Amino acid sequence: GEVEYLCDYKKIREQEYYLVKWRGYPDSESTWEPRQNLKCVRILKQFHKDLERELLRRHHRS
């Protein structure tokens, strides 16, 4: 299975999950996958940096 891109992130409650858009599936077929299922470290880093910037934007608002 190859991750094309990550769509979202959640943590319940110790366990982290990622909404994964799979290569060869349409966008609406993305599925939630626990961190250990995934090998795509570059994509994870880019995803996290992107989200970090958005939370920082929000932190500054306050």
Numbering used by the authors: 43 to 104
The authors write:
SUV39H1 is the first identified histone lysine methyltransferase (HMT) in human. It catalyzes di- and tri-methylation of lysine 9 of histone H3, which are related to chromatin packaging and gene silencing.
However, it exists as a monomer in solution. The fold is composed of an N-terminal SH3-like β-barrel, followed by a long C-terminal helix α1(residues 82–100). The β-barrel consists of a sheet with three antiparalled strands β1 (residues 45–53), β2 (residues 58–64) and β3 (residues 73–76). Thus the two aromatic residues, W64 and Y67, in the loop between β2 and β3 form a partial aromatic cage, which is a conserved structural feature among chromodomain proteins and other Royal family members. This may implicate that the cage structural element is not essential for fold stability. We purified two SUV39H1 constructs including the one used for crystallization (aa 44–106) and the one containing a complete aromatic cage (aa 42–100). By means of fluorescence polarization assay, we found that the partial chromodomain does not show detectable binding to any histone H3K9 peptides.
